[PDB]
Amino acid sequence: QYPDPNDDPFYRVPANINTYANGQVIQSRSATTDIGTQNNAASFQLLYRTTDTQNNATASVATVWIPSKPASPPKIFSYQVYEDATQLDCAPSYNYLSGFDQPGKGTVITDTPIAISWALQQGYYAVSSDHEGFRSAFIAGYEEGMAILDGVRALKNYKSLPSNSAVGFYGYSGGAHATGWAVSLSGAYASDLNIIGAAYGGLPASAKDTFLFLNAKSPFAGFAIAGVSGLALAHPDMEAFIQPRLNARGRQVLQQIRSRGQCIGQVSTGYPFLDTFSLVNDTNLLNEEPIVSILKAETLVQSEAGYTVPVPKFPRFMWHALEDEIVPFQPDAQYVKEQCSKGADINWNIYPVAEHISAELLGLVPALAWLETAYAGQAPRVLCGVGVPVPQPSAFTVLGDKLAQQFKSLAGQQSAFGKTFPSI
Amino acid sequence: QYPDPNDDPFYRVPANINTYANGQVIQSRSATTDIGTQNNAASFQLLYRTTDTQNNATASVATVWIPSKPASPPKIFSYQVYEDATQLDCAPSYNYLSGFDQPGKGTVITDTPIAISWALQQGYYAVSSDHEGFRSAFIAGYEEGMAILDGVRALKNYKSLPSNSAVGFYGYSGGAHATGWAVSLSGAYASDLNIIGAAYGGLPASAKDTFLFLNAKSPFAGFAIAGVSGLALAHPDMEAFIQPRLNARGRQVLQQIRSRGQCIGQVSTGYPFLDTFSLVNDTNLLNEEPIVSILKAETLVQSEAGYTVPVPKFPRFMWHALEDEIVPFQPDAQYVKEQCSKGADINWNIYPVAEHISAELLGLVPALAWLETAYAGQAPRVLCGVGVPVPQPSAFTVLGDKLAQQFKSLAGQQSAFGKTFPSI
Amino acid sequence: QYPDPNDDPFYRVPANINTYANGQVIQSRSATTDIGTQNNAASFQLLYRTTDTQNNATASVATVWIPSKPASPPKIFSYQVYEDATQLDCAPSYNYLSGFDQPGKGTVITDTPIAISWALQQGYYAVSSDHEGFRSAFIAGYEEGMAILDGVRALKNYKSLPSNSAVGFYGYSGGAHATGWAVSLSGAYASDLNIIGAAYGGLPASAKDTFLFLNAKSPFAGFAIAGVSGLALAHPDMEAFIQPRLNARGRQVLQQIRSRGQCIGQVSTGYPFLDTFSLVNDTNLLNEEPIVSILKAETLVQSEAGYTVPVPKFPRFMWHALEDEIVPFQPDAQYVKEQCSKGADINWNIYPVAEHISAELLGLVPALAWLETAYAGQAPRVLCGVGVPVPQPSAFTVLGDKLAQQFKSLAGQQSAFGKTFPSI
Ligand SMILES: *[C@@H]1O[C@H](CO)[C@@H](O)[C@H](O)[C@H]1NC(C)=O
Numbered sequence A, B, C: 001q002y003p004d005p006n007d008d009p010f011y012r013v014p015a016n017i018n019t020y021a022n023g024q025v026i027q028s029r030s031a032t033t034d035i036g037t038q039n040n041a042a043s044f045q046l047l048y049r050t051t052d053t054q055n056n057a058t059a060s061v062a063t064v065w066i067p068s069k070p071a072s073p074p075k076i077f078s079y080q081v082y083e084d085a086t087q088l089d090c091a092p093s094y095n096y097l098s099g100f101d102q103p104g105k106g107t108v109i110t111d112t113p114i115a116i117s118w119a120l121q122q123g124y125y126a127v128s129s130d131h132e133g134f135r136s137a138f139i140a141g142y143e144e145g146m147a148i149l150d151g152v153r154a155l156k157n158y159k160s161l162p163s164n165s166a167v168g169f170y171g172y173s174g175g176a177h178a179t180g181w182a183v184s185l186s187g188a189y190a191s192d193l194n195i196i197g198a199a200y201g202g203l204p205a206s207a208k209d210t211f212l213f214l215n216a217k218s219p220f221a222g223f224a225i226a227g228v229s230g231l232a233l234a235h236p237d238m239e240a241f242i243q244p245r246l247n248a249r250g251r252q253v254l255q256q257i258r259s260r261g262q263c264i265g266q267v268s269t270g271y272p273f274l275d276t277f278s279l280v281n282d283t284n285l286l287n288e289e290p291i292v293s294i295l296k297a298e299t300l301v302q303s304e305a306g307y308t309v310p311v312p313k314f315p316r317f318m319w320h321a322l323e324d325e326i327v328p329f330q331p332d333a334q335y336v337k338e339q340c341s342k343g344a345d346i347n348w349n350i351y352p353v354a355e356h357i358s359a360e361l362l363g364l365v366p367a368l369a370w371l372e373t374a375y376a377g378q379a380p381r382v383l384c385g386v387g388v389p390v391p392q393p394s395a396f397t398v399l400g401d402k403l404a405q406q407f408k409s410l411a412g413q414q415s416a417f418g419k420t421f422p423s424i
């Protein structure tokens, strides 16, 4: 329907970009999508204003879906696609369009149409932002987190949705990492968003870990470079550090991984068992500045982080393949523990017999079930941080109100042992 | 009531065996059994036609119990007893008979009469086949699997039961191994059977493994030799391989373990910590032909097998002692894991504080409770291959029909990562 | 409100102590407590007659709270405070009193009041016995077990509550340990008490283990000596043994750890990383008599004990911080396994992300929720000794009553494998 976004003027940041607020509509246009056609629910591409990794004011695009029989009070579903590619013609918005001549068409057609159809048939509003942006940086959380949040803001703006509108999130693999940074940032960057829940599995919580896991050792080592690419695309001084150190073979590989039509299918398989350190003159590159610091800002694991990782309280549903061969299980589990230790509300599901592929479907029907409850404000009180759902009773049920509030007010104070009571 | 089955003309393969179809009754006779008298349900021994480990046409017996007020629509319960002996006078049919002078009386008096009584009082048709056969081969799955399935067939024939009559399976320990092979073969050999569910714990999934565990290192080392015996009784080339390699001391042990009245009680207790390798010449005899091939054909663990292990879809309930001292937990754990990844429906229960005797009873009461759901077609949708039941919701619930069928067609296809969506 | 109990005449054992029965009230007096004022429930201090660690007849004090709208039929709640001190001015009764001039005020103000308040508003009679006694022995189970049980008797006596009155227990940490010995002893010492359930987490089942765990390697090393002190106060020959071996520094630590106002707060933080062995000449002395014999009686765990550890059958709810840094997790786990293997009824809940302080709160509201069920005689049938609740069905309903009695009959007898059916 539309061109390759490299040539579309829609995929350009206006000069007055700073006059736009964060999450504000710059301009709109109708879009015929497979997903909209199947649900009889109009879809539009929205050019909106967001922020980037250096707080320069930029823009991105997000496709939206308006259900023909909408739910009351309004509810919003935000699916985060796993682009997992460093090219603008692999962006969600373009590949959603009804049509067969877009390269990264595969990322939006496997499980995605079901979720988004689910949301729309539930009467919910659907939004999916090119969380990677015009930059198309991949695995950079700060750009992804703001872009997705503002994408929801933009959805509320475009349709004049109430400011208390309930907002739910889904996301697998890179879409999780998107969903998971949208939630870390959700506190500061978009406290106007009433986030009733965030369902996401296969989270690559720490970058450096996901790199070392795939680097030199998996047929998906292509993601190692696609990751480096996207971070250097979002951290310009890293680009400045990498470029003069790239060797002959290195320059071809980076140029290829950034070219047109180099989407998730090509990235996955195109560079199997490739050691990204071989592409570079220096293998000590991770320990060197600015790369070492950029990694430690681009992780959700607190024991690694160079910053204070926020701990969102709203309902979260999370899963992961124990046996994950692409996205490591150790960091995701670690993040869940750390967030639970500081009072998160994480329904944690571990799949013993699982593959990164197998878990994508395993987690879909539980998560979608879970989200419908969280829109009704009735996601199950379960034990945080257990591989399995464990249904704990309610304080305002068991104790009654005064005791419940007296019980809850213990958090922060000290037990008889000197150590301080945590959030419980 | 009857003579020793070795002397009984009933326990004989007729000469016209090939005129009979698989699961056709050759002749019947009254059996006055304790289980029948207890439940007010007439019982008969059915000599019926089956097939064996060399596809030559044979026979076996199965006792059946006809309830006084049978359930509608007809449902059939098939208990697999743990004979765990290589002797015809330890065969179930005989010891089921009212009387105290048969040697293998113990297997059908502990927990077994409760199981069959449950089914009969449920109004179900009850049958238990001498899964070991006239050969009384022990640990040979193929003879046991066919013998049981034909028992169900023959039970349907004897009573003119609808051909879609609902069929459930129970078995612990050697009865599990009986029941666990009846299910593998059920696909090819007995797709005529409406298999509504199969509850079985303490499975000796791998022959070789269950052997290695008991051999020379357990007070129940008798099951190691009783195993060797049972495979050689069903595999004549294994027989021919062992016979000249046995030493005098070995011949004594094999003659004894095969003698009259050497049933499960005498076998378990008769040979403590006995090293089967001393009894026969050549210590590498397991690695040598034809035994090595028979082992890798007589295992359900796909990583060992020399064949493609079937993965039945119908509802399954399975348990096991984590702390099991007779049947190793590792192979059964392995088998269950594997079948789930290829789309099995296995409700998995692991017992943390458990003993083989203790787990026999622990799992008995849930499994029967579970089967009654499975007879109503309502076995719990739970997460397959997880140690504890986790009720995951339904697709035709979460998605609705069109989204459900669209979701279901994902299995088999490719994700964006190249690898294939499994059965999920 | 009242003086330091060392100076109070109420805190004295009368000379005719032997005229009193076990659990008979010596005399009472009103107590104006913070908890009493808040719930509108009159409170009294009860001096009552109990037994001690050498079967010589003694006395202790226990506070009670009588609800203004009592539940019918009478029900009793027995909260066990985690005194964790070898000093009488740290006793529960005194610190309960409205007031701020008691040193060990903290143990009765955090989670303790919410537990009791729950109880009173539910209509239960509340009691909390100074389980350590006038001796204030800490970690000495036999004095704690008898003191708490008689505290319950004394309360039945004081108000003339019927002899089949339902009696429930709560206790975490040192209060659990007390709660845990009162349950072992419940059988012998108090078959008159109708104990409907006992919820307790973080149990230091082994004295010797909890000693080693904290000793010299944890900031709570004060509990090592506070434990040691508490035993030597209740085992006079241990006192006689340690006293001449104390070196200069040792006598200072022991006099101090016992002096006034050295309560749980003072012990907890006051002696971090202190080696008990450094204080007393003879590192081998813990291995030497009579401490080694005292420790074997002291450990609840059987694999350690020098006696037959009782396995009470009534419902128990138990938790424990897996990552517990104060009360080691393994001895509670070991204890639980053993009790379950011998037919106990322990509902076991393990906390994955946990610290001693956090598990205190995690488990409190589930336990109170649970106890409310057990007072209704309907604590959940779940799988014993498993980290998570697995709802096991009723044998009677599944098998049927006649079959269930036969299944009950099977326990104690022999299985077909020779070993004996356990209690299941
Ligand atoms: C090559 O690597 C060294 C360290 O191994 C690094 O200091 C240097 O800048 C690199 N040279 C370039 C620019 O290729």
Ligand SMILES: *[C@@H]1O[C@H](CO)[C@@H](O)[C@H](O)[C@H]1NC(C)=O
Residues within 6 Å of the ligand: B244, B245, B281, B282, B283
């Ligand atoms: C004894 O075993 C050896 C191999 O170790 C074999 O060659 C020989 O034939 C055996 N003796 C028999 C089968 O009588």
Ligand SMILES: *[C@@H]1O[C@H](CO)[C@@H](O)[C@H](O)[C@H]1NC(C)=O
Residues within 6 Å of the ligand: C244, C245, C246, C281, C282, C285
């Ligand atoms: C030292 O230890 C010994 C043996 O344990 C004991 O007899 C003695 O009283 C202790 N006191 C000193 C300092 O001699």
